[PDB]
Amino acid sequence: YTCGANTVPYQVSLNSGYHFCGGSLINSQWVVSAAHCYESGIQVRLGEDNINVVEGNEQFISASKSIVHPSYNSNTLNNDIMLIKLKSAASLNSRVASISLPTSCASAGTQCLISGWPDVLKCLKAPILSDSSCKSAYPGQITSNMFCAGYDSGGPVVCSGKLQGIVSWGSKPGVYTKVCNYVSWIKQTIASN
Numbered sequence: 001y002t003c004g005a006n007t008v009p010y011q012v013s014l015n016s017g018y019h020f021c022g023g024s025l026i027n028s029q030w031v032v033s034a035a036h037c038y039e040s041g042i043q044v045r046l047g048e049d050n051i052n053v054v055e056g057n058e059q060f061i062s063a064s065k066s067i068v069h070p071s072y073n074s075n076t077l078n079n080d081i082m083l084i085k086l087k088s089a090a091s092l093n094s095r096v097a098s099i100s101l102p103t104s105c106a107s108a109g110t111q112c113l114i115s116g117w118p119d120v121l122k123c124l125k126a127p128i129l130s131d132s133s134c135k136s137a138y139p140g141q142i143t144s145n146m147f148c149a150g151y152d153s154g155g156p157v158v159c160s161g162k163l164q165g166i167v168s169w170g171s172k173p174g175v176y177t178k179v180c181n182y183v184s185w186i187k188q189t190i191a192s193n
């Protein structure tokens with residue numbers, strides 16, 4: 001469904017000439033996205049609703065650095081996470097806001113908000129599926145760094161106010177990078193860059 005303009009203020013659009021992936025603002029200088037979204041010349045677009053019209057609340061900021069997870073495997077999408085640094089800090093406001101990293105993993109059954117990009121932001125509320133339901137849908141392919149939820153990519157999966165997933169792959173529920181496994185890496189990496 002249509003989220004409503006700026007109702008997901010941590011949602012970002014990654015643009016290299018066009019919207020190629022979503023991401024999540026985790027502080028004024030850093031965005032989390034999927035490693036499979038990696039490409040050169042990224043501009044981070046904050047405060048977006050319609051990605052084809054300047055509506056008045058946008059901030060466009062060039063990325064200064066991208067860091068793909070050291071263990072990212074593009075064949076399997078294991079460890080599908082990357083960090084993007086903003087060249088200048090975003091000006092935080094009601095429509096441009098960070099989302100908190102988790103301190104613990106979410107449980108099966110927890111409802112989450114998945115969002116991403118006709119040209120306005122779309123939303124889906126869906127529960128995290130059991131481990132078994134997830135792995136049964138994709139035998140051989142699910143690792144401990146993935147979860148499924150259900151009944152673009154790189155965008156957020158937010159549960160109880162925490163960024164628990166990144167839109168990674170699918171076909172059959174969606175498969176999401178399990179952010180709670182990466183919090184130490186995220187925190188150390190951003191602090192060191």
Ligand SMILES: [Ca+2]
Nearest residue numbers: 050053054055
């Ligand atoms: Ca816009």
